[PDB]
């Protein structure tokens, strides 16, 4: 059966106010001689979690300033630098002063992904959607949440290791509710999650199907470390009565490209475990390649995520570039920051993530991957 569940949370977008706190100690009952048929692909907890996360995002973004005047013509010179690629744009614009009859010529430092030409540029979302600035105090850090069933329902956990996503689970337990799910919004690599028990776990709805993604779960985490080395000072511009807009006023020196590092010595033999478990499915003689990315939107071609409040888009063309045959150097991934974010594949509700002052660092755990096969491959 399907039922609505509530949090058990121990300022954030994932508000802990309008749902109950956690029990002091979990109650886990091991159901002996019970073999229940799980199917995570038809799971309704995933859909309820997705709807709840979208709702929390909407309720967090709702009581904060709409940046309606920002969709104007922008005189965008390149930011002061010696150089190949001008990624940061120094855009000046007329903005509405708190008095309706007065204007102010202000400026900001936008990104190249946030502006499209018409020297006259405009914000990328003026064509398609209205924009709402995220609240600066409100933090985007994931927080654990446990989804707990109401009275008359129970949650069965599959304590059995080596568990395939579908089919019978010989070792079933009942829990009041789950562990910290920690809702990280990322693509191409699962960050901050469960780390399995025995060996790397390959799970797909149909292995033969290409159209359905492959979820890989790691044994040991692969540590990924980011920096946005730029300073990106924040400045407030009063765009109306009681309404403020936070712009990247200036950058203290060394305009450098953002990046997240992975260890080469760990990512190799992590991919070794992955290709071993994949050859378990596709025969013990097939050569297994990993390729850059097929294509698509920016959110999919690049490992996109939120580090320290800023939205990174890391290339990861060096990670997935390997050929595997049956028989302290770091991989640096150049990431691109972006402020105009269209979350949950929704068009109509954009969002302006404010600048974060100073430098920001990831130290996160790659605990899994999402993949897709290439199709074809007759024999």
């Amino acid at each position, epitope marked *: 059966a399907e039922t609505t569940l509530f949090c058990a949370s121990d300022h954030n977008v994932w508000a802990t106010h309008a749902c109950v706190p956690t029990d002091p100690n979990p109650q886990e009952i091991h159901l002996e001689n019970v073999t229940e048929e799980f199917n995570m692909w038809k799971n309704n907890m995933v859909e309820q979690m997705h709807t709840d996360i979208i709702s929390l995002w909407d309720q967090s973004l709702k009581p904060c300033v709409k940046l309606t005047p920002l969709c104007v013509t922008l005189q965008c010179t390149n930011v*002061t630098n*010696n150089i*190949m690629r001008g990624e940061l744009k120094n855009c000046s614009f007329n903005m509405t002063t708190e008095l309706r009859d007065k204007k102010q010529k202000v400026y900001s430092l936008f990104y190249r992904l946030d502006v499209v030409q018409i020297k006259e540029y405009r914000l990328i979302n003026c064509n398609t959607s209205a924009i709402t600035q995220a609240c600066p105090k409100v933090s985007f850090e994931p927080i654990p949440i446990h989804y707990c069933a109401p009275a008359g329902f129970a949650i069965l956990k599959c304590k059995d290791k080596k568990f395939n996503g579908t089919g019978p689970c010989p070792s079933v337990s009942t829990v009041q509710c789950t562990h910290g799910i920690k809702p990280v919004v990322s693509t191409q690599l699962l960050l901050n999650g469960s780390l399995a028990e025995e060996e790397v776990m390959i799970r797909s709805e149909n292995i033969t199907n290409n159209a359905k993604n492959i979820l890989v779960q790691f044994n040991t985490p692969v540590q990924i470390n980011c920096t946005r*080395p730029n300073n990106n000072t924040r400045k407030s511009i009063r765009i109306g009565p009681g309404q403020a807009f936070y712009a990247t006023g200036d950058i203290i*020196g*060394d*305009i450098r490209q953002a990046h997240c590092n992975v260890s080469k010595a760990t990512w190799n033999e992590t991919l070794g475990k992955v290709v071993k478990q994949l050859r378990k499915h596709f025969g013990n003689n097939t050569i297994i390649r990993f390729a850059n990315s097929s294509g698509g939107d920016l959110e999919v071609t690049t490992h996109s995520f939120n580090c320290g409040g800023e939205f990174f888009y890391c290339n990861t063309s060096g990670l997935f570039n390997s050929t595997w045959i049956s028989n302290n150097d770091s991989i640096t991934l150049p990431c691109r920051i972006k402020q105009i974010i269209n979350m949950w594949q929704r068009i109509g509700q954009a969002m302006y993530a404010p600048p974060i002052q100073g430098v920001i660092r990831c130290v996160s755990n790659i605990t899994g991957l999402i993949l897709t096969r290439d199709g074809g491959s007759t024999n």
Partner: antibody, heavy 132, light 106 residues
């Protein structure tokens, strides 16, 4: 030791090419980066480009097509031809030697560095003047 | 500009604009009736044979003008000083910096 001696016309008319020639003694021409600096009287020096083998030359954007530098390996000489001289060109000239570097400040693979030059040793001086 | 300092005392010379990036300042020294001469490159690395008395402010700091410290100055240092600046967030400056004339009272 490295000795630099510069010889030129001494007095050149406007719109007539000036040839300043510098002889180096102590090291081979192919093994070092050669620089030219023009100092107007009472003002700061002004770097007017450097020359090397394998086409590693960047001249001043102001004197882009005017000054040209050439090298003579057999004679151990370096020549400068400055075209279209004016009254403002009357200045002391020095023929110096640059040793480069790399002030790294970033990831290096993303080309987050720049190469900086400095005059390790100096010449003598040649106050070339222009009379109309 | 002109700066005058007695023997045996520190003299601070500021040359060029404010810092904006990872900056490399090369401090020269032109004696009267003499060619320029290197005294500092890479903001602290003196060349071979130059006295260790001179020092320079590091380029790792942003928004601060280049500063040359000359401690226990003597008669030899009475000369001009032109600083060549290499900022990462600025194109190459093919003209040297505004010189400063260190004058010893002796």
């Amino acid at each position: 030791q490295v000795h630099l001696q510069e010889s030129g016309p001494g007095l050149v008319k406007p719109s007539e090419t000036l040839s300043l020639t510098c002889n180096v003694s102590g090291t081979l021409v192919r093994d070092n980066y050669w620089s030219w600096i023009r100092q107007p009287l009472g003002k700061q020096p002004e770097w007017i480009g450097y020359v090397h083998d394998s086409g590693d030359t960047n001249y001043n954007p102001s004197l882009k097509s005017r000054v040209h530098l050439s090298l003579d390996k057999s004679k151990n000489l370096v020549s400068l031809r400055l075209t279209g001289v004016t009254a403002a060109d009357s200045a002391i000239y020095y023929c110096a030697t640059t040793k480069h570097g790399r002030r790294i400040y970033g990831v290096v693979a993303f080309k987050e560095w720049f190469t900086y030059f400095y005059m390790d040793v100096w010449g003598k001086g040649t106050s070339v003047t222009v009379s109309s | 500009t002109f700066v005058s300092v007695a023997p045996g005392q520190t003299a601070r010379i500021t040359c060029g604009e404010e810092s904006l990036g990872s900056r490399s300042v090369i401090w020269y020294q032109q004696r009267p009736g003499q060619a320029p001469s290197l005294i500092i490159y890479n903001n602290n690395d003196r060349p071979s044979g130059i006295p260790d008395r001179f020092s320079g402010s590091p380029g790792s700091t942003f928004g601060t003008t280049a500063t040359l410290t000359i401690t226990s100055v003597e008669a030899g240092d009475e000369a001009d000083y032109y600083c060549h600046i290499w900022d990462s967030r600025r194109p190459t400056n093919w003209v040297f910096g505004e010189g400063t004339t260190l004058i010893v009272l002796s």
